[PDB]
Design a protein around this ligand. Sequence first.
Ligand SMILES: *[C@@H]1O[C@H](CO)[C@@H](O[C@@H]2O[C@H](CO)[C@@H](O)[C@H](O)[C@@H]2O)[C@H](O)[C@H]1NC(C)=O
Ligand SMILES: *[C@@H]1O[C@H](CO)[C@@H](O)[C@H](O)[C@H]1NC(C)=O
Lengths: 97, 48
Amino acid sequence: NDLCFTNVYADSFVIKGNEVSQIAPGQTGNIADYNYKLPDDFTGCVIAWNSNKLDSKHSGNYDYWYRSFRKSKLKPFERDISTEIYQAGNKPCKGKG
Amino acid sequence: EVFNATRFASVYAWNRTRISNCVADYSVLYNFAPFFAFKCYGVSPTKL
Ligand SMILES: *[C@@H]1O[C@H](CO)[C@@H](O[C@@H]2O[C@H](CO)[C@@H](O)[C@H](O)[C@@H]2O)[C@H](O)[C@H]1NC(C)=O
Ligand SMILES: *[C@@H]1O[C@H](CO)[C@@H](O)[C@H](O)[C@H]1NC(C)=O
């Protein structure tokens, strides 16, 4: 409360518990490499609180997503919203299975 | 042959294999496992 910040970015995303400890400057994992990479010299804070009342219901809910397959690592502070079938082997395959 | 195995030995007797006289393209290491912890220490995994 006694500092001054030229600008402040607030990135919000619900995510599983282990990924909370995954989210940190200079880490690894399916999220830290393909979904959200925090740059090394990061100046700020992370906030994580439990929300089982807004992300849950009877019969289940599957609205949330994540990316476990990307052609390369995600650069710091970049978004990669894309639905491209990952290539395995040498097939130009465009489909699921 | 070390990622296609079926009886990965228990930790008390850790199977140790030696890799030599070969060309190591770690794409074949990447395709055989949807990784969970690729924490590299001596070398950055991209620079492999
Ligand atoms: C660790 O496990 C490897 C895969 O099973 C073994 O490599 C192979 O082992 C078979 C016999 O199971 C050999 O016929 C083959 O040539 C290859 O070496 C490896 O020996 C094993 N190592 C130890 C120390 O258990
Ligand atoms: C192991 O090799 C068999 C060969 O038929 C292959 O079908 C299978 O996908 C391989 N699995 C792993 C984990 O290497």
